[PDB]
Amino acid sequence: TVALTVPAAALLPDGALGESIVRGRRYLSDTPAQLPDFVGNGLACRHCHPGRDGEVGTEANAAPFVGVVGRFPQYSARHGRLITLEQRIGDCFERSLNGRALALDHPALIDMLAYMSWLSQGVPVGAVVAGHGIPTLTLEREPDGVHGEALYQARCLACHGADGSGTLDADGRYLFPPLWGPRSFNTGAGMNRQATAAGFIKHGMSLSDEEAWDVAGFVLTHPRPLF
Ligand code: HEC
Ligand code: HEC
C-alpha cells in the first residue's frame, strides 16, 4: 500500500479546476441541499465518508476518497462487469442516498470527480492507499440484537436518537444522521450489510468487536426504505 495524505487546501490552484474542486467538496458535504433532485433521504456523502477540516473522505477505515480515482475502472459483482468511478458514485446516490444517479457528464458529478482527484494527487495509479474502504468486521456467532439494544441506549442514542432518526442542526442538515427509518440509507446500501455496518461502527463510533457486532445487529433490525 501507499500512505494516506491529505493535500493542503491553501495550495489549491487558481482557475477552473480549483473552483470545481471547491464545488465538489460542497456537493459531497451538503448533498441533500445542493442536489435535491438526486437525493431521496437526509444523508450527505460525508455521513459515511467523513473528513476533518471541512474535507470529505479523508479518514482511514471510513472509506476515504484519497486514492480512489486510481482504482477505477474495476469489476463490480453487483453489475457483472467493469464500472467507472462515475458509475460507482451513481450507485451510492441510488442506494446510500435513496435517490437517483446523476448523468455521467453532469457538472456536479464532474466537480465531485475533480475533488476526489485532488484528494488523490500524488497517488500512483493502481496503488492501494492505507485505510481505504470500510474494513468488514465479522464474528463467528449470531449478532445479539437484545444486547445491541442495550449498547445502543448506552453508547449511540444520545446522538442518533431513541428512534434512530438523528439530530438536525440549526441549518436543517443532519448533525447526527438517521440510522433507520425513512430518511436513512435504503436496503440496497452497503451499510445495510451486517459486517459492513459492524466495521463502520467499530472504526468510527471504545467499542469492542463483540459490542460493534451486536449493536450493528440491533441497528439492522429496523425498517428503512426499500431499494
Ligand atoms: C450510508 C453510508 C454511505 C453514504 C451516505 C455514502 N456512501 Fe459511498 N460508500 C459506502 C460504503 C459502505 C462503501 C464501501 C467501502 C468499501 O469499499 O469498503 C462506499 C464506497 C464508495 C466509493 C468507492 C470507494 C472505494 O474505495 O472503492 C465511492 C466513490 C463512494 N462511496 C462515493 C459516495 C458519494 C459520492 C456519496 C454521496 C453521494 C456516498 N458515497 C454516500 C457508504 C456510503
Ligand atoms: C458524538 C455523537 C455520535 C455517537 C455517540 C455515535 N455516532 Fe454514529 N455518527 C455520528 C456522526 C456525526 C456521523 C456522520 C459521520 C461522521 O462525521 O463521523 C455518524 C455516522 C454513523 C453511521 C453512518 C451514517 C448513517 O446515517 O447510517 C452509522 C451506521 C452510525 N453512525 C452508527 C452509530 C452507532 C451504532 C453508535 C453507537 C455505537 C454511534 N453511531 C455513536 C455521531 C455519533
Side-chain angles (χ1 to χ4, degrees), residues 1-205 207-227:
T1 64
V2 298
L4 195 168
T5 56
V6 181
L11 289 177
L12 275 176
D14 292 336
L17 184 57
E19 292 185 1
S20 171
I21 291 162
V22 170
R23 292 190 299 271
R25 185 197 287 127
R26 185 169 58 251
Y27 289 126
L28 293 166
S29 182
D30 193 30
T31 330
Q34 298 308 314
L35 293 166
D37 301 324
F38 303 96
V39 181
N41 67 15
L43 301 186
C45 312
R46 70 167 179 88
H47 287 132
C48 302
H49 300 275
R52 57 190 103 171
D53 300 311
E55 304 301 346
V56 182
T58 59
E59 277 297 303
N61 306 313
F65 298 142
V66 177
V68 70
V69 305
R71 302 196 296 257
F72 284 83
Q74 69 182 217
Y75 187 76
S76 170
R78 202 180 245 169
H79 289 250
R81 60 185 344 136
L82 257 68
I83 63 170
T84 64
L85 179 53
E86 291 96 324
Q87 291 177 293
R88 181 69 188 80
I89 291 169
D91 288 336
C92 264
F93 269 92
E94 293 177 353
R95 296 162 181 267
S96 297
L97 267 56
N98 195 38
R100 194 228 312 204
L102 284 66
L104 301 172
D105 60 352
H106 193 294
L109 182 60
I110 297 176
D111 291 337
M112 291 183 279
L113 295 169
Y115 180 79
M116 296 182 184
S117 301
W118 176 67
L119 286 183
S120 299
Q121 66 180 81
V123 178
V125 171
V128 176
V129 170
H132 76 96
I134 291 156
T136 52
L137 172 60
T138 308
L139 279 64
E140 304 302 317
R141 65 165 175 85
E142 293 289 308
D144 177 346
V146 175
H147 188 219
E149 179 163 31
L151 288 165
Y152 184 86
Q153 287 176 15
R155 304 295 276 289
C156 317
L157 190 151
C159 294
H160 289 289
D163 57 4
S165 72
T167 299
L168 292 168
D169 74 14
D171 296 304
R173 282 72 169 181
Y174 281 101
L175 173 61
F176 309 132
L179 300 187
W180 63 85
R183 303 303 293 164
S184 194
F185 58 84
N186 72 31
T187 58
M191 199 63 67
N192 198 46
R193 298 188 315 251
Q194 170 66 26
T196 292
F200 185 84
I201 289 158
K202 173 72 185 194
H203 297 293
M205 291 285 117
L207 290 182
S208 68
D209 288 356
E210 308 277 332
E211 291 170 335
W213 186 246
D214 291 340
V215 76
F218 170 70
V219 167
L220 298 173
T221 62
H222 296 94
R224 67 184 60 262
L226 185 64
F227 178 65

